[PDB]
A paper describes a structure:
Tripartite motif (TRIM) family proteins are RING-type E3 ligases that play key regulatory roles in innate immune signalling pathways that lead to the induction of a type I interferon (IFN) response and production of inflammatory cytokines through activation of the IRF3 and NF-κB transcription factors. Activation of RIG-I initiates a signalling cascade that depends on the E3 ligase activity of TRIM25 and induces the production of IFNs and inflammatory cytokines. An example is non-structural protein 1 (NS1) of influenza A viruses (IAV), a multifunctional virulence factor that binds many host proteins during infection, including TRIM2527–29. To understand NS1-mediated inhibition of TRIM25 activity on a molecular level we have determined crystal structures of the CC domain of TRIM25 in complex with NS1-FL and the isolated ED, and of a TRIM25 CC-PRYSPRY fragment, which includes the RIG-I-recognition domain of TRIM25.
Author numbering:
A (entry chain B), D (entry chain B): 86 to 205
B (entry chain A), C (entry chain A): 190 to 362
The structure:
């Protein structure tokens, strides 16, 4: 059983966004971006990724959404597409959540990410 | 003074021609180097693939062992009850033969029945009522049989989870 | 009074003959019963064996999936470095062609060398020293490759232990 | 890998013994016997059994031996040979040890039994 999970729509995957105050880091084989001008918002982390043997296999794109639907953060594999693992993703998600929590945002992870990247 | 500047040029070029062969040869040895390097990563990769396949053949043979062991348990539970039924069948058949035999004697004692001597010969036959025997219940062990199947399904599920913990350790492309 | 005791006997025997058919028939229906009972335990056992085999075919297919997935990771690590070497090969080949080309121009500029006009044509060629370029090291990921093999061996060992926990649940004969 | 373990010699397997004060129990598919006249002895439980997948498969015979080599106890499958499991054996061993400890004996289990009936 090999499934592909799509938290994001075709338009959310292609939509463009800019950071009002850019903040960027390369975290091994993943790139983490966030707008540090976003404050006091409820944010949800949505991701499109493949799954094999009921565990995460490959991340395609992860984006952070406000309640208003705007993109304020992102975790994406480097353009060279060096391989990453679910560990790389889980750590990147922790880095991005802490970065967004600095300005008192409240970050949640989609249920698909919880079921397939973690074990709870 | 110009036939001298051409001699000067000819001199600098033939010495620049020799530096050029040492670098053309140097380039050719660098080419051989990378071809040999990438040949080495092939041998390295094929050997690890060959080592992987020998592990999975061991695993497939473990499964074959487990399977024939579990089907041997089930088939020996089958033959346990079917043998107990076979001893029961032969009891009931023997009991059926005694009755069939004795009835035949009664049937051909009553064909010589109007001979005066019928009574003395047939007072023996009213007495034999050789009909008894108790048979205890034989019970196929359904719980055992179904449990082998249920925990064989468990084995599959923990195998699927084992595989998942392996593949998550490395990236996929 | 004796032809009466024979009539009395004949009477008791023909009524004992009829009780004997009801028990011969009763025995035959008991025989059919056990044959049908033991036929039932066959069907029951064969179906559970058939259900076992369908589980082990799923397991063997999980292993095939894991195997082709692990060999795909190894072969894609192979092609990652071998492609980087291929771009390096073509760089070194191009650098080798520029040198080969320019040396040929110098070789046939020095064949028309005693023509007075050699200098004006060949002062351009001492200047070009188009020899540079840096190549970063390409490193096959041995830890990744060997780890796939090591934890595939782990998968086999926990499969062997999983099988052991299953078979210990039931008796063997 | 399917091995057969022989704590006992061919002569220990065939030697005959009697209980000076018999004590017998049927514990499911196994028969437990011991001499309750044995006191203040160090006893060792030896067993011949088959092993499959590195776990106990079938017990053939288990006998209790004093330091002097005498048989004072026994655990054997019923003559009908109904199937038993390692659980049946482990429980039977616990019953026989407690029965022998009543008269202040000190019972030990062979290393083969420890490695293949238990997990320690």
């Amino acid at each position: 059983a090999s499934r592909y999970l799509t938290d994001m729509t075709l338009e959310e995957m292609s939509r463009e966004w800019s950071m009002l105050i850019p903040k960027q880091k390369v975290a091994g084989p993943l790139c983490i971006r966030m707008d540090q001008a976003i404050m006091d918002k409820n944010i949800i982390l949505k991701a499109n990724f493949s799954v094999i043997f009921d565990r995460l296999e490959t991340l395609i794109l992860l984006r952070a959404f406000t309640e208003e639907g705007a993109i304020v953060g992102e975790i994406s594999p480097l353009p060279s597409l060096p391989g990453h693992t679910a560990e790389d993703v889980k750590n990147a998600v922790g880095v991005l959540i802490g970065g967004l929590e600095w300005n008192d945002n409240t970050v949640r992870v989609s249920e698909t990410l919880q079921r397939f990247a973690w074990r709870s | 003074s110009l036939s001298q500047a051409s001699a000067d040029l000819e001199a600098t070029l033939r010495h620049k021609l020799t530096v050029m062969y040492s670098q053309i040869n140097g380039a050719s040895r660098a080419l051989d180097d990378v071809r040999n390097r990438q040949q080495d990563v092939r041998m390295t990769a094929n050997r690890k693939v060959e080592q992987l396949q020998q592990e999975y053949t061991e695993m497939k043979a473990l499964l074959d062992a487990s399977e024939t062991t579990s089907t041997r348990k089930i088939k020996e539970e089958e033959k346990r009850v079917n043998s107990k039924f076979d001893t029961i069948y032969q009891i009931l058949l023997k009991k059926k033969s005694e009755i069939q035999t004795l009835k035949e004697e009664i049937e051909q004692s009553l064909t010589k029945r109007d001979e005066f001597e019928f009574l003395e010969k047939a007072s023996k036959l009213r007495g034999i009522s050789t009909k008894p025997v108790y048979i205890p219940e034989v019970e196929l062990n359904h719980k055992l049989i179904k449990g082998i199947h249920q925990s064989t399904i468990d084995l599959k599920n923990e195998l699927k989870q084992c595989i998942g913990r392996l593949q998550e350790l490395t990236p996929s492309s």
